[PDB]
C-alpha cells in the first residue's frame, strides 16, 4: 500500500469530522489527491486496517507529535511582541518549473515577454533553463540570454504575481492533464496494425505531410530496426526469444537484420539457425508478422526494465 492509500484508510477510519479537521491542515494539492484516492476505495481488509493503524502510531511516535501550527503561532507571537508559506509556495513553484519537460515549459513560456522569460529562467536550475533556451528561436533565445546577463532583480510583489499566474496555468494544465496525442501515440497505434493498413496509413500521412509521417516513423518500432540496436541488447533479447519464434520471424527478415541476429548468437546456434532457415519451407506472412510482433513486445518489455536500449 502506498502512503496515499494508508492516509486514505486512516481518514476513512477516524470519522468525517476528524477527517475534515485534518484536511484543514493540508495543502490544496494533498487534499485533492486524497479526495481522488478516497473516491476509488472499494474495500479495506483487516490487514489494511490493523497495519495502517500500527504504522500511524509508529509514525506519530517517530516525530513525537508536537509541531503546533507554524503560521498561526508565528503570527500570534509577532503580534504580541511587535514570506512564510508564500515563500514556500514560490520555492515549490520554482521546483515545479524544473521537473517538467523542457519542450512543455518552453511552449508554456514561448509567448511571454522576453524579460518575463529571462526572469523565470534565472530562478530555475541551470540545466532546465539551458534546455528551455535551446528550443527557442535564435532571436528570442539570444534576447532572453542578454536580458539574463543584465538581470537587475525583481520586486517580491511582481515575482509573487508571476508565480500565482504560473500556478494558475499549471492548475489548468493538470486539470486538462493532456492525454498523449503526439506522434508517439499514433506510432503505438500504427505498430499494432496489420502491415497492410499500417503501411497505407504511413504512406497517406507522408502524402499529407512527409515530416509528420517521419516523426511518426521515428517514434515507432516496426521491426527491422533491430540492426541499429547495440549488440549487447540483441544478445540480451535472444535469451528471452524462443528458437522457433526467432526462426519464423527471421524468415521474412532482411539479410542485414538476419546477420545482425546471427552475429549475436553462439556459433553452434547460429549454424543451427542457418540450417533451419535453409531447410524450412515457406511460412505464411501472417505468422511471421505475429512472431515479429511478439519479439517487438519482448523488446518493449526489456526496454521498460532498462535491460535493453532502443
Amino acid at each position: 500500500l502506498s502512503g496515499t492509500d494508508k492516509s486514505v484508510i486512516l481518514l476513512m477510519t477516524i470519522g468525517e469530522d476528524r477527517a475534515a479537521e485534518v484536511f484543514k491542515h493540508l495543502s490544496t494539492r494533498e487534499v485533492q489527491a486524497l479526495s481522488t484516492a478516497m473516491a476509488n476505495v472499494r474495500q479495506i481488509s483487516n490487514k489494511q486496517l490493523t497495519d495502517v493503524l500500527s504504522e500511524f502510531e509508529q509514525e506519530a511516535e517517530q516525530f513525537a507529535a508536537l509541531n503546533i501550527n507554524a503560521n498561526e503561532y508565528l503570527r500570534s507571537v509577532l503580534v504580541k511582541a511587535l514570506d512564510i508559506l508564500e515563500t514556500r509556495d514560490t520555492t515549490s513553484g520554482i521546483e515545479t518549473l524544473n521537473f517538467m519537460e523542457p519542450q512543455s515549459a518552453a511552449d508554456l513560456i514561448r509567448d511571454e515577454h522576453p524579460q518575463i522569460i529571462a526572469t523565470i529562467l534565472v530562478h530555475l536550475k541551470r540545466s532546465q533553463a539551458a534546455d528551455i533556451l535551446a528550443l527557442f528561436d535564435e532571436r528570442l533565445r539570444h534576447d532572453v540570454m542578454l536580458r539574463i546577463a543584465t538581470f537587475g532583480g525583481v520586486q517580491p510583489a511582481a515575482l509573487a504575481e508571476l508565480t500565482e499566474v504560473l500556478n494558475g496555468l499549471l492548475d489548468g494544465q493538470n486539470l486538462k492533464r493532456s492525454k498523449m496525442g503526439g506522434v508517439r501515440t499514433a506510432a503505438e497505434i500504427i505498430n499494432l496494425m496489420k502491415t497492410q493498413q499500417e503501411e497505407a496509413v504511413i504512406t497517406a500521412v507522408r502524402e499529407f505531410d512527409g515530416e509528420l509521417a517521419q516523426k511518426i516513423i521515428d517514434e515507432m518500432f516496426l521491426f527491422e530496426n533491430l540492426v541499429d540496436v547495440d549488440d549487447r541488447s540483441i544478445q540480451r533479447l535472444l535469451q528471452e526469444v524462443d528458437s522457433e519464434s526467432l526462426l519464423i520471424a527471421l524468415k521474412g527478415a532482411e539479410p542485414p537484420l538476419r546477420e545482425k541476429f546471427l552475429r549475436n548468437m553462439s556459433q553452434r546456434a547460429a549454424d543451427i539457425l542457418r540450417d533451419d532457415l535453409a531447410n524450412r519451407g515457406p511460412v505464411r506472412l501472417s505468422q511471421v508478422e505475429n512472431e515479429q510482433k511478439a519479439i517487438l513486445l519482448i523488446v518493449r518489455r526489456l526496454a521498460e526494465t532498462g535491460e535493453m536500449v532502443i
Partner: peptide, 27 residues
Amino acid sequence: MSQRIREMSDNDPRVVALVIRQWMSND
C-alpha cells in the same frame, strides 16, 4: 478493533496531517 482506534481518534489533527504528508512524500 481494540482501544487503539479510540486512542487514534483523540490525536491532534495536525499530527494526523503531518503523518499523511510524510506518507505521501515517501511514495
